[PDB]
């Protein structure tokens, strides 16, 4: 019944060598209330990780954490930035997201535009497309559907909406599976492109089924910093106020003691100490 946290680590799943996404999820298993906080990849932090890692203890973007030290560095860096202990962990890359969509049998979307949703003009390695109308689409099409931006009058906001739709529809299919063999069919298809310490067993299936009607009330939040240019690159410096607010909101969902401005603990490069 105890609330717990999940770090979702999207390895090069975002939209120069990589665009990671990190989402901190809180889950209350009793009330089913769930929240998701997106952590901007450009946020400047001191990396945490193994003492034998050459980059542990130096400042970098959050975007660099997984490339520098793997799952351990990503977990430890987020833990020290938010001053919490992370309970559960799910990591997947772009190849695995494509495989996941196919493994659940596809998803159904509607293209409301008067032309195909496609991105090859702007990102030539992605040639799949979604014709106008309603279609059951494969994983390569789902990637394009969640990335297209320049043909949308609402720009990156229309894009974020479509990406939200895709992840929501995939999660709905996963959490609807009612047997361990059905889960293991998906685990077989994605294979090592997804790693987690979430137990998927006949014992836990009843509980995951119980979250089917929690995905419709998830509150979403974003942790962002003040934009700064350092050596030609784009960085974000979180303010003391905004970090405290994000930490305490998550702590509040997790049943943990909140911090004050005077005892705030973080490895983030705070704006007020940078300047």
Alpha helices, DSSP H, located in 139-204: 139-147, 155-175, 180-190
**Angle, CA 252 vertex, CA 65 and CA 73 arms, to 5°:** 15
Residue 269 tokens read as: 């490069």
**Angle, CA 18 vertex, CA 15 and CA 20 arms, to 5°:** 65
Spatial CA neighbour of 138 closest among 88, 213, 184, 189: 189
Answer for the pair 37, 84: CB distance below 8 angstroms, yes or no.
Answer: no
- For residue 210, give its domain range: 4-94+191-274
With respect to residue 181, please indicate whether it lies within any of the assigned structural domains.
no
CATH number of the domain enclosing 233? 3.30.420.590
Helix H or strand E encompassing 82: helix 65-82
Cβ neighbour number for residue 202 with a 10 Å cutoff: 10
Single out the residue in 175, 210, 225 at which a domain terminates: 175
Cα–Cα distance, 41 to 235 (Å, whole number): 9
By residue count, the chain amounts to 275
With respect to residue 23, please indicate whether it lies within any of the assigned structural domains.
yes
Q: How far is CA 136 from the centre of its chain?
A: 24
Tell whether 138 and 270 lie within a shared domain. Answer: no
Coil, strand or helix at 7: strand
CA distances from 118 to 63, 111, 139, 154, 187 (A): 27, 11, 14, 16, 29
Cα–Cα distance, 104 to 166 (Å, whole number): 12
Cα–Cα distance, 36 to 39 (Å, whole number): 10
CATH number of the domain enclosing 106? 3.40.630.190
**Resolution value (Å, 1 decimal):** 1.8
DSSP 132: S
Cβ neighbour number for residue 47 with a 10 Å cutoff: 24
């Amino acid at each position: 019944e105890k609330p717990f946290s999940i770090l979702l680590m999207g390895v090069d799943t975002g939209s120069e060598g990589n665009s990671d996404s990190m989402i901190l999820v809180t889950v209350n298993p009793k009330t089913k209330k769930t929240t998701m906080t997106s952590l901007e990849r450009d946020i400047l932090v001191k990396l945490s990780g193994s003492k034998t890692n050459d980059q542990t203890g130096y400042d970098a973007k959050l975007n660099a954490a997984y490339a520098a030290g793997g799952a351990k560095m990503a977990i430890m860096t987020v833990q020290d930035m938010l001053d919490i202990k992370i309970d559960k962990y799910v990591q997947i890359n772009m190849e695995g997201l494509v495989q996941l969509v196919d493994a659940v049998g596809g998803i159904t979307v509607t293209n409301h535009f008067d032309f195909p949703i496609s991105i090859e003009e702007h990102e030539p390695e992605f040639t799949a497309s979604v014709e106008p109308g309603t279609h059951k689409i494969n994983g390569e099409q789902a990637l394009v559907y969640s990335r297209m931006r320049y043909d949308d009058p609402d720009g990156d906001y229309g894009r974020q909406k479509r990406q939200r739709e895709v992840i929501s529809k995939v999660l709905k299919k996963i959490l609807a599976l009612d047997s361990v063999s059905k889960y293991r069919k998906i685990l077989s298809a994605v294979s090592k492109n997804m790693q987690t310490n979430i137990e998927i067993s006949s014992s836990t299936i009843p509980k995951l089924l119980g979250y089917s009607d929690a995905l419709k009330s998830i509150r979403t939040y974003q942790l962002k910093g003040e934009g700064t240019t350092i050596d030609g690159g784009s960085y974000q410096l979180v303010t003391s106020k905004e970090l405290l607010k994000a930490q305490n909101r998550i702590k509040g969902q997790l049943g943990l003691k909140k911090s004050t401005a005077e005892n705030l603990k973080t490895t983030a490069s705070l704006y007020e100490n940078f300047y």
